[PDB]
Design a protein around this ligand. Sequence first.
Ligand SMILES: Nc1ncnc2c1ncn2[C@@H]1O[C@H](COP(=O)(O)OP(=O)(O)O)[C@@H](O)[C@H]1O
Ligand SMILES: Nc1ncnc2c1ncn2[C@@H]1O[C@H](COP(=O)(O)OP(=O)(O)O)[C@@H](O)[C@H]1O
Ligand code: BEF
Ligand code: BEF
Ligand code: BEF
Ligand SMILES: [Mg+2]
Ligand SMILES: [Mg+2]
Lengths: 410, 407
Amino acid sequence: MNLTELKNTPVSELITLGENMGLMRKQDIIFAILKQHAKSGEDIFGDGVLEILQDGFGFLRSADSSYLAGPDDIYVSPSQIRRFNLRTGDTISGKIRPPKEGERYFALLKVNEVNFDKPENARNKILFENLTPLHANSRLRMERGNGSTEDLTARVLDLASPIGRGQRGLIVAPPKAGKTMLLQNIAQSIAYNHPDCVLMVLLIDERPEEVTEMQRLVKGEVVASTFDEPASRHVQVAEMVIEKAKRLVEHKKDVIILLDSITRLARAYNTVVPASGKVLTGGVDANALHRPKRFFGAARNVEEGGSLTIIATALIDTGSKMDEVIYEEFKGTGNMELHLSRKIAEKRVFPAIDYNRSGTRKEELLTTQEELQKMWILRKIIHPMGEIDAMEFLINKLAMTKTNDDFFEM
Amino acid sequence: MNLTELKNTPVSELITLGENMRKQDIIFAILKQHAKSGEDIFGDGVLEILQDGFGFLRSADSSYLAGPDDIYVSPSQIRRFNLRTGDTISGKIRPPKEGERYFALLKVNEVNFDKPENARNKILFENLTPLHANSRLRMERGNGSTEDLTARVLDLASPIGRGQRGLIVAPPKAGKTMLLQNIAQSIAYNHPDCVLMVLLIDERPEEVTEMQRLVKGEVVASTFDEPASRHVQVAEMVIEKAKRLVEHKKDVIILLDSITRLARAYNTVVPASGKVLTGGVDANALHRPKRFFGAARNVEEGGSLTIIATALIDTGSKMDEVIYEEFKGTGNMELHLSRKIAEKRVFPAIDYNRSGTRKEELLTTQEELQKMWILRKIIHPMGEIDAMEFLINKLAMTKTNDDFFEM
RNA sequence: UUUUUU
Ligand SMILES: Nc1ncnc2c1ncn2[C@@H]1O[C@H](COP(=O)(O)OP(=O)(O)O)[C@@H](O)[C@H]1O
Ligand SMILES: Nc1ncnc2c1ncn2[C@@H]1O[C@H](COP(=O)(O)OP(=O)(O)O)[C@@H](O)[C@H]1O
Ligand code: BEF
Ligand code: BEF
Ligand code: BEF
Ligand SMILES: [Mg+2]
Ligand SMILES: [Mg+2]
């Protein structure tokens, strides 16, 4: 019946349909199954994400290829685009027919769904670039409230630096400070308390095993480009994922991108960027931080509905200036920053947060005056201490209570 | 009757054989008379695909260098089993014809120690699924030797599992190179199953000599005398070969020495870019070092690739400190030694505070975790010399199992 | 390459 489902199904299950149907590697099999079905006059359909090209024609890339070239892409004539003012990144599904003689890929016969809805109103929606941005109004609690070793990290986060819809936050740390895992922890908390928010996890250049473990423990879009992949691929994949987010927000949707190693993407851009000379400090070109700044500055809050929030990990104290530079370039664009110390982790104390450098901007919109000056006191009391001291202190002070309970107490 | 054997055979020995039947000249002669009557010949090597599409079979004595006795491999055959560089091949062969200068692959008998036919079903390495280390690699020995102390402390400070992308950092003179030797011997005794390769790139040649005579396995090497270009090629041959076996679901462990030297050899050999990183190291000169080191991994399909290499710090350049940070962010088993603790002649000079591996909980049992955690809490305070001596004495008492138990 | 970048 449908392509994607045919490509999902196991090898052996396809085979029983083949013999029963009537009549070779999996690709061959599914193609053969499709042709007979199509000759019978029965409808066919696949699903993919739009990618307009230079010549004006576009394709429907698959998620199982990081949205890069795929032998199963579906052609979308320029005619089909102008008909629904489609843009790169739109998620489309519809009836399609196999490649006639000569034609190499399947073709989009007719469109049914544009970004999960009807393409007839997806022409009246206001453009992403003309939306009206705001600070985070609505809020995102991370304390699922489960009295566990993990909900500690969530709570501490919820206290040090709160998150809101449209959060352009950033998690700064030096290798092995728990950043990546903290991201994982944030992911799971968002899934439990916010199934309504669409979750996309983008891993640019971080560890292979991390991607596979992420997929299994995370519910949602998991796109990745390991360090195996060249910088070319990293930029392609990430740029595809950012446009996809933009499009859904256009449909007044709330999306959440978790990017591991944003600075890795900054380096990937660096190599890709044409040398302008005037190399900045740390061997970083002057124009190489435009695209990445534009990628991060993309997250925002819309006054007409939906929103896009990006939380990425930054790298500091690594012997290189590049990282210091990239940290300041994004800190001067984001709305939230959370630092972790390389020392609150060597002690094995977790989460190893540097509560002194953490914090978000415009907190009085993401909290009630009471919780506000509650955290303000918690801040005052801790500032004078040290990194590990403050933490251990902080932690065991709430190891025995709920977030609100702890409050009432203290 | 077999090329490889005739090659390693001493010049004077097989002289007797000759009469009943230049040394390179003679070997050519000797095979050609073995081929005259139709008697078979047998050779072996590691395929190296080239731009033309056809490949050669490199030998270990050449260090996988261009070799005169190499076996040409028709692209025809490669397609037959879709081979790739680094594969180990052996099979029937015939003597080079007049005009022809090198030997050719008549037929294939076995690919990667396995019947040639099976290659088609094997899943590609890049398409394999990774995970955090599952099985555990213990260096501890019941021997209770004077030297076993290092294996035991390392086993405590920083566990190693299958597919462990480890890294060992110290200032020169810290016994980091020699620890690597020790580590090499330990898995040799406790793990015959694991395929063992030792790669020495650039660092000293006496070390090469020491290692080969004392290590049970393959010893690929490239002294610093050699330009940066072989260092690259020899290392790349090794890593590809290691990837081949993991495709077979085998367990490969590479004890790379002077990984920073490899990164530097990559730096010396790289297209110029306008930007340069701190330390002089090129901004775009670390992708290849990263992919090489990040090659190690764990597979659900079966088999594993484990790479553990030496890293230099407090070098006097920042290249080295920057490169340490770079692999730090890729690996999952960092190690450290200190000059101050090696000064006093106390060994290992291991710095427990800085040492550590990621996701130890899967490698160690709950009991193992608690004792380790207790230990680290107690040692954290103590100084490198004081702390180290402090545990060493207790370690001399009993192997780590008994020591933690009495504790 | 010099400047920038180290
Ligand atoms: N909260 C925590 N709980 C348990 N282990 C942790 C925690 N934070 C850090 N770690 C340990 O630190 C290691 C590396 O941290 P990770 O966040 O993966 O690195 P990075 O921050 O550089 O991405 C992990 O393998 C884990 O064992
Ligand atoms: N555990 C040890 N026992 C005895 N000698 C040691 C020990 N560790 C290091 N050394 C000495 O330190 C010297 C330098 O260490 P080595 O690891 O060989 O060089 P590097 O650490 O620079 O690679 C060695 O020659 C060795 O004699
Ligand atoms: F080493 Be972490 F992933 F920055
Ligand atoms: F981050 Be500020 F706007 F310089
Ligand atoms: F010269 Be040693 F290997 F630091
Ligand atoms: Mg990380
Ligand atoms: Mg050495």
